[PDB]
């Protein structure tokens, strides 16, 4: 797992993340349905959705990423003992919403992308080797459930 000092630095850039996190999740999602369109087809609520002024403009698409990066800060700021929030978190993405763990993969990139996109100053090359560490955590520990429940993702 991360030491202190990487704990740290993903905890600073995520203070940043709280600032607005509303605004945060629509850009990730955004990323992540431009970079990823077969992402977008998981979502019943705006899968219809085809242009970027189309998804900024959804309030749907906008509470679905923020409550995405809410749920993430929670696990972030356990650094790692997160079995707990971690739990429904799987089940869910794991019965109800099957995301393949590749899916995963995409939105981490998607996150650290927006983060080093608007926050530099607080995102340098360790810190985003730091965050890095941390959702490839999230992903290993969530694969891990997906077995138990009974989804290969
Ligand atoms: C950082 C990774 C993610 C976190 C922390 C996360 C968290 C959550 C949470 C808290 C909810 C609402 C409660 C629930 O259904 O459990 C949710 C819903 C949902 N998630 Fe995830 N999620 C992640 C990644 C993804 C990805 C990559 C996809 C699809 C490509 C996805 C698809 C969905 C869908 C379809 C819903 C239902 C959306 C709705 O209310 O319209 N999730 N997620
Ligand atoms: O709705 N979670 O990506
Ligand atoms: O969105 N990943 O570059």
Do not use: C
């Amino acid at each position: 797992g991360l030491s202190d000092g990487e704990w740290q630095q993903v905890l600073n850039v995520w203070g940043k993340v709280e600032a607005d996190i509303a605004g945060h999740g629509q850009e990730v999602l955004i990323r992540l349905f431009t970079g990823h369109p077969e992402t977008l087809e998981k979502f019943d609520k705006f899968k219809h959705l085809k242009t970027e002024a189309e998804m900024k403009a959804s309030e749907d698409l906008k509470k679905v990423g923020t409550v995405v990066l809410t749920a993430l800060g929670g696990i972030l700021k356990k650094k790692g003992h997160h079995e707990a929030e971690l739990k429904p978190l799987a089940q869910s993405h794991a019965t109800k919403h099957k995301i393949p763990i590749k899916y995963l993969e995409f939105i981490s990139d998607a996150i650290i992308h927006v983060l080093h996109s608007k926050h530099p100053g607080d995102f340098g090359a360790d810190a985003q080797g730091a965050m890095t560490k941390a959702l490839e955590l999230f992903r290993n520990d969530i694969a891990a459930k997906y077995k138990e429940l009974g989804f290969q993702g």
